[PDB]
Paper text:
[name]-4 proteins are expressed in the plasma membrane and form Ca2+-activated Cl- channels by assembling as pentamers. The channel comprises five [name] subunits arranged symmetrically around a central ion pore that is ~95 Å long. The diameter of the pore varies along its length and contains two constrictions, the ‘neck’ and the ‘aperture’, both of which are lined by hydrophobic amino acids. To address these questions we determined a series of cryo-electron microscopy (cryo-EM) structures of chicken [name] with and without Ca2+ in activated, deactivated, and inactivated states that represent the major gating transitions of the channel.
Inactivation is stimulated by high (>500 nM) concentrations of Ca2+ and is caused by the binding of a C-terminal ‘inactivation peptide’, contained within amino acids 346–367, to a receptor on the channel’s cytosolic surface that is located near the Ca2+ clasp. To begin studying the structural basis of gating in [name], we determined a 3.1 Å resolution cryo-EM structure of Ca2+-bound [name] without an antibody (the same construct used for X-ray studies, comprising residues 1–405 of chicken [name], and termed BEST1405). From single particle analysis we obtained only a single conformation, which indicates substantial conformational homogeneity among the ~300,000 channel molecules in the dataset. The conformation of the channel is indistinguishable from the previously published X-ray structure. As in the X-ray structure, each of the inactivation peptides, of which there are five owing to the symmetry of the channel, is bound to its cytosolic receptor and well defined in the density. Therefore, this cryo-EM structure also represents a Ca2+-bound inactivated state. This result indicates that antibody binding does not distort the channel from a native conformation and reflects a satisfying correspondence of structures determined using X-ray crystallography and cryo-EM methodologies. The channel inactivates at higher concentrations of Ca2+ through a mechanism that involves the binding of the C-terminal inactivation peptide to its receptor. The receptor is on the cytosolic surface of the channel and the binding of the inactivation peptide to it allosterically controls the conformation of the neck from a distance.
Numbering used by the authors:
A (entry chain C), B (entry chain B), C (entry chain A), D (entry chain E), E (entry chain D): 2 to 364
The structure:
Amino acid sequence: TVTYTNRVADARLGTFSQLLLQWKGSIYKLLYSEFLIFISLYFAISLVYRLILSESQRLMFEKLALYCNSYAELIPVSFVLGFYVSLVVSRWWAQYESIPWPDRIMNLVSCNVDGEDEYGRLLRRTLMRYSNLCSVLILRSVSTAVYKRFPSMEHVVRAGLMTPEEHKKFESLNSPHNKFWIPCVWFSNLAVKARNEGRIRDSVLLQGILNELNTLRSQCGRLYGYDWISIPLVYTQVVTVAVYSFFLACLIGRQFLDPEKAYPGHELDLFVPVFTFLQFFFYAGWLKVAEQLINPFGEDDDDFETNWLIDRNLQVSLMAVDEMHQDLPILEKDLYWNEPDPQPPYTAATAEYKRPSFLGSTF
Amino acid sequence: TVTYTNRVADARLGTFSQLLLQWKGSIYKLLYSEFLIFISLYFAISLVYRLILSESQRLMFEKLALYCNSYAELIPVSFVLGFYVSLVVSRWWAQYESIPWPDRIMNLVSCNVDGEDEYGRLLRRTLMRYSNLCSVLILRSVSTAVYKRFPSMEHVVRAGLMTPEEHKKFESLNSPHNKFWIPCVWFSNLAVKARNEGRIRDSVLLQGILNELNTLRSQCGRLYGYDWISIPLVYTQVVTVAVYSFFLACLIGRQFLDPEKAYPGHELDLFVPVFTFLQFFFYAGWLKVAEQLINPFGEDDDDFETNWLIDRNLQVSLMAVDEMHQDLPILEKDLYWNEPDPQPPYTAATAEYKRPSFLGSTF
Amino acid sequence: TVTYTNRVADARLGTFSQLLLQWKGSIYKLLYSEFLIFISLYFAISLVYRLILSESQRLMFEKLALYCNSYAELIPVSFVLGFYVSLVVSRWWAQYESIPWPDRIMNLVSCNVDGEDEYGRLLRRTLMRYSNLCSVLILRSVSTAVYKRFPSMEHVVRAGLMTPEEHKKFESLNSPHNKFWIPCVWFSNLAVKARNEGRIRDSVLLQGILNELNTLRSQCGRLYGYDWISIPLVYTQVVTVAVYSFFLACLIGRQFLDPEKAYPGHELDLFVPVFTFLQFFFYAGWLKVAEQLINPFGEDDDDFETNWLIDRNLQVSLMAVDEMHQDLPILEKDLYWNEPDPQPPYTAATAEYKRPSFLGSTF
Amino acid sequence: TVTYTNRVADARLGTFSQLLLQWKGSIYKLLYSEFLIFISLYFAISLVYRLILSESQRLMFEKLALYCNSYAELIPVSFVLGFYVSLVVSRWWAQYESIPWPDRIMNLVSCNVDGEDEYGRLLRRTLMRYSNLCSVLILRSVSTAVYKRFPSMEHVVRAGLMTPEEHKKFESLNSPHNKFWIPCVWFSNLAVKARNEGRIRDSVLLQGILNELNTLRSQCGRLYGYDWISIPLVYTQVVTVAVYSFFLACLIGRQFLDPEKAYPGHELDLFVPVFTFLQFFFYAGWLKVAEQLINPFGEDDDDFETNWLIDRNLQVSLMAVDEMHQDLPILEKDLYWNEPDPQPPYTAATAEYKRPSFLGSTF
Amino acid sequence: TVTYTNRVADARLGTFSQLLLQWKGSIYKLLYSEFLIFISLYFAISLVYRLILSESQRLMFEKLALYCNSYAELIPVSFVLGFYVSLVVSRWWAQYESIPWPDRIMNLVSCNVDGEDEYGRLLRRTLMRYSNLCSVLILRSVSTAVYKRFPSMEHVVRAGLMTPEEHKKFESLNSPHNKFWIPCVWFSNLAVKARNEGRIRDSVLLQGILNELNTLRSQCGRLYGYDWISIPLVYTQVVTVAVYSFFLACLIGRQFLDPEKAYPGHELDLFVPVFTFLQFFFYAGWLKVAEQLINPFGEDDDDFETNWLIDRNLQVSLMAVDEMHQDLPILEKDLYWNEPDPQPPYTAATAEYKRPSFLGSTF
Ligand SMILES: [Ca+2]
Ligand SMILES: [Ca+2]
Ligand SMILES: [Ca+2]
Ligand SMILES: [Ca+2]
Ligand SMILES: [Ca+2]
């Protein structure tokens, strides 16, 4: 995504002021086309009122501009954007926590599957390759950034995520439904086959591996759930009527009428509404928070970088069960072997952050 | 339901604008009958004011139209729709997560119940058939889309979800209460009977199966809970008084009075209120979000497709414990057997999504 | 409670319109006495203004009616009802999920406590009778609907929930505090006594039973917590001042003044305020949502039917560990023994609900 | 706290009306001193305007009173009280659920630690005494009601929560940080020492005890977390500026100006503002909800009664592992030994609460 | 952070009034520079209007000041600050609960890893040193207060958190991604190596240690998640446009116009706006709640004191597995050996807090 966490660590003077100058993933990149439509529809109405209309027709238009200005109220639109965006953002973070990480299975496979030989090394690599394949097959079904990377099953085989003997089995299992559950069943049968040859010692270690598989299966079941059960379409169509009804009234009610007749509220002619345009960046920009996060697996600048994460999870999983299985650093006494009060040193810029120990608020 | 997740992946120009043109499951299909009642009651009042009423009676009506326009305020109605719909939508997603999925039991039954013979294959099919039957009997009690598919117990037997010898036992258990708990007790006794014949090796594998049964029993207990304990009727009757009190005031307060008397606020006669009708699509359409989601197991276009999901869960469960029990693809070295840095390839349209690795915000 | 889930399954025309006509548990049964107080205090003021007051006193009253009409504003009252009712309803559903269900213990006791003889059958009935007694003793402490059914310990013994030999032990345990924890300790010692005679095979099955006891103990600890720690009284007294301050201003500010003096806002005399009474059904009815749900174990029409649920949990628990212990239907091949694509049939009214399988949004 | 759950069980007429008459823990006991400051500052301004000021100075004051009345608006203050109190109340209930209860450890220690002799009885009393001591040492650090009961370690020894041989060990462990974690480490080593002498049979029962210890350790870690990480001080200082800015404007803007000049809005002189004082009970009373719950372990009338709960948890824990270890009532056939349909009897006042069994909404 | 929990324990008179006088971490330290910009831009406009502008130009400016005063409305800005700060604060507390604590692993390592000799003591110190190193490597990636303490890997070795033989292994593991997962894999292999030499007795104790490792791995995975997936930048840029659009209108609309022309609303010249400046402390100060909590690991006065917590977790973990392994106080009969009703004594200031036991609300 767009990470600006380093910029906003402290509350300086230009903390949020400098974030308005950024372009990538900003409000300006989203509202670029909607602004020029709103400018062009605004000044077309103003040039008709200032050049084209006759005197009897300008009086007819000024009664229309005072009628539209009454319904152009800001308060009830801010309600329905507030409860809708709070629904989208709560669904947004819940889909990030549903993205499966191999690291809980990675710890147990790398220690409880014995064997330093060729067959035991091959057994640990195949277990973790199924756990990655059970995650690639659910991300390519829900993320357009992954589906363009893997458009077919042949692209999965060419990437090494599925050997060609597995694809021959994967096609013979004739099922019309989605097949993301299949590598998470091959994980269960290979782990039990590992137990029956003595690669796992006890049943408690086998059940501990199978419990972390079903955690990863429930993670993939949530991503299938948020993708299939969208936000209700009637509740998306409400909040986009109310935003477009507000901006329809502001095309007519926020014109600059002729001050020589001196209507109440239009005493000054300024040729460009500064504060009406700033409400367009406010209200339409707070709708673009909903348009960008309603599917966080697309190709926006703030959607999830899932193509990166597949490349991370493949490299890390095949490194911890292959190059780190029973390969430990040599045990040695640390620096605090005889010191019961360890005091790690401070640098110069951090030495004012030495706080006394918090004993409790009652002291 | 109605899935539009593919349309709203990116934040383009016509992202939410194109969703207003869709018909199925939209605001127009719900508000079709309420709109024509509101049009017919509106213009009946206008034709009486413009044709039927005398001059002394029009003056009596104009004082009524200015009285009703004061109570036709929009702000406090938007409060009580906001907190009510946020209750319905939070209950809406919590009932989707209560729909039981067999896949956690499906992994453990397909690996820990040994036997490739006829009796062991028959034992795994009967365990998963009880877990599906314990879900069909709770969905036909809470979903009108399932009850019309299975109106009696005889339809369950004809669908193969219950053998006729089981229905003879299911009727002899004389109980006045709902009997969805019975197949989840038959699962427990058959799994212990499987252990005593040596089909399950250790007690830890038996307890791991029985823990995933009680998870599925707690899933069925929530669907029984949301169906029995509705949203409070006094709290549904409040939010439908406040919407109908608003539209009652807008039938009289939003008339176009005679501009020749020039009341403040009614200076223009336009013969059709454009912005009053757009508030009808806003407020009554944001009540139809509550009317459609208050029971998401009915037959609306956005209620849950549970008839599909029974057909999925029956086909997948009897495929993973029958055709996939100890039927593995042949183990083979993958492409990254000697490469400690796996780099899966990118397509042409995805090659700009190569990001450097996120090391942390402090770097 | 009042279940109307069958009525609101679909979004028809008269979906929420027909719910206003229902009486039981409605807004009309709650606001019956408060409405007649508000009518009688309203028209008493109006008859004094129209018959009793002199001309100099009516002028003094009209300045009071314009003063009270300024403070009779609707917006800030709707805030504090919104956040207060959202607190009550979140506490309301959290107390339903704290009501203990025996069904998770019922599965494990009915399969892991061996013995088809007289002593083993008596052992399973006593385990489940303690789990029901540990729930009756916490419901009679928190629910007035249960305490009127069981006013003393003698009513518990006459209902068969406690044998007279257990009450002799239950009184000798001299403790001033509440004794709902005692049957959940007798469950632990009887389950360990069952293990030492060989009725439970392994320690893993014993710990699986004891884990589901402590789940039920934590359920009873929440019901003790919500009953002892109420909503703060200062926060209940705020929201009932603001509702009564609003209705105090509407008794004077919403009078119909004399239109012959033509005050701004009171141009019409109508003898009965229609929209002021509809705000009484709105605001006072949205306070009755809080008055009814602040203790959902009382005797309102929408409080929890806990007297029913004790009769269910006693009949079901003593049926699954007695008549269903190792009493299985005969294993038999189902209809889909040779069909790898099960297609359960559809009825006539459900045949349009055949959907193609959802493969994912990217397809 | 103040428990009024018995009063508000039903929705009668005077349900919330009678709660305004209560004194203890009410809005009147909190706002007693702030009201007399607000009365004395109000009528001091009024007596200066009515007696002290000259004619040219009263005209200068009336322009100030109309200026302050414009900023005395109620709507934006109600926002920031609503989101702040909803933060406090969500943190309030989360600290009650963090208060550790011994009852989950109490079940497992009372059954799995064998021995009816003197040493086995002494072993169970010492395990539960560490679990109470690990809770007293965290409550005296976070609760001022407990710290005044136990000001030093010597008061803990005199209360019998720590034997003098344990305090000699508790002081030799030289650590500057808070030492609430020490009795939860002594519990782990004594439970393993119990296993190695044969007092606990299997490792599964030992791990089941140690899992319920770490649950209680995570409960004490939350109370340390809510006490150390307060609500942000900048977010407390915002909501108390906005309340005091509102009441500063109401000291001048809500004066009764002279009606002989007849300003718009001040047409009547009434000598005491009734509705301005009722907004003081509303807004300042809804700030006292935040002032009382921001530390629920203090000595307010609605803070948590934790001194009571230590006396409960000490008496109950040493009663269930001492007088109830393997002391069971005699097993006997209950009343429903031969009746498969148990029907417990109803009293006279409860016989109308016989409901038919809820089969599901689709029936 | 800034802990004021001792001050606000009771609801006294000056409870929240005294918090405005505090400087550290307050609203005044954050708004110090933004206030002087707002003062200097305000009085520059006022001195131009009072000294520089001509008579025809002052009339042109007064029409601009009445135009800007209409858009300077407070209500819709308070919506979008309310939903944005409620998002930040919910993410704020969720990152505190993601900070890993060693104390759950600390209990199990200190009891289940046998051996009082030199090798067994060295084995327990190395297990807990990996669990601290797996937390330092994730905090130095997300916290600028920790990264300035440990700028490189060489500072980790000099602090004794990593022996130089481990850094030689830590560099040979060639991976471009972040390496916080590596010490949580070394923990798994050393714990299994401990089992194979007989330092851990059974597999159930080994799986209990490995389950508490993966809990700590999921804690570190959340801190990596909140740091990488920020609040959406478009949703931060909306709420800072709306605050700055409000203050732009208040620089012109809140001027004091000339009262000799007597515009409606500007009847009095007061030379300094008191209530406009108090809205600056309100609105801009309620934006500084968001600016300070959006990254709670920085160096603000209310960000998390994580440098302290590393020094605590290092001292406590190496004290409980070294000086407290099987070092128990001597078992002895407590004071309540023969008293079945323990009554711990009360002090003088706490003796009025003797409450009778809460039996339940129905009594
Ligand atoms: Ca997107
Ligand atoms: Ca529906
Ligand atoms: Ca009630
Ligand atoms: Ca307090
Ligand atoms: Ca910060």
